[PDB]
Structure formats: structure tokens, C-alpha cells
Amino acid sequence: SDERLRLFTEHAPAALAMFDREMRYLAVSRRWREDYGLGDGDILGMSHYDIFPEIGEEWKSVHRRGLAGEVIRVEEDCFVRADGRTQWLRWEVRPWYEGEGRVGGVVIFTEDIT
């Protein structure tokens, strides 16, 4: 399971990442690295929050909410970019599970709908 999940995320057609409890990268899809400007180096075990330290507590709440077993999906969401241009998003945050029924972390997905 765990590895297959990890491999499935790496291999995913869209932008996917998998994280542990500390929001540290367990795995990344290729689109995710591109979409998030992450490079091709090894980022595994790195922390999303160190990498982006300007996130805003709004995401932190969501990440927290997911880490407690909530599946969060928003079909069309809207942000206004620092750009000044509005961007539209589809995203999902959901927990993944350890062998025991303890939450391992989260898997997150996003796509530009805009």
C-alpha cells in the first residue's frame, strides 16, 4: 500500500504530492514540481513550509483539517494572485493512512481551472 501510493503519486498525470504529519514531502508528481517551481533535485523529506514560508494560515488550517481525517475538496475556488489577476483552482486535500488507522499525512491535488 504505502509504496504503491507513493509511486502512484509520483506517477500521477496531474499535480499530486503526498506528505507526512509534518508536511514534509513523501512524494511528488512531475506536474507538482513544475507547478510549484520545485526543481528536479531531491526534495523528499523537505518541508513544504520551509520551502514556502509565506503560505498564509488559511492553508495551514486546511492542511490541519485534512490531517485529522477530513477530506477536503473544492471544485472551483478563486484566488486573486499577487499578480492582480484572478486564478481559478480545483483542489483536494485528503488524509492517507498508516497500517494502524493513524493518519500518516495528506495527499493534495490541485489544477488550474482558469
Count of residues that bind its own copies according to CB under 8 A: 23
CB of 61 to its own copies, least distance (A): 19
Based on CB atoms, which residue is closest to its own copies, 1 or 82? Answer: 1
Output the CA torsion sign for 19, 25, 27, 28. Answer: positive
14: amino acid identity, one letter: A
> Pattern 43-62, binding to its own copies, x per CB under 8 A?
xx------------------
The answer for residues whose C-beta is within 8 angstroms of residue 39's C-beta and 6 or more apart is 33
Please state the closest distance from residue 54 (CB atom) to its own copies, in A: 22
Cβ–Cβ < 8 Å for 25, 17: yes
Q: Does 4 bind its own copies (CB under 8 A)?
A: yes
Residue 56 Cβ, how far from its own copies at the closest point, in Å? Answer: 25
CA 6 remoteness from chain centre: 13
Residues 6+ apart with CB under 8 A from 25: 17, 18, 19, 43, 44, 45, 46, 47, 48
Q: Please identify which residue in 53, 81, 99, 102 interacts with its own copies, judged by CB under 8 A.
A: 99
Per CB under 8 A, residues contacting its own copies are 1, 3-8, 10-13, 30, 33, 39-44, 71, 73, 75, 99
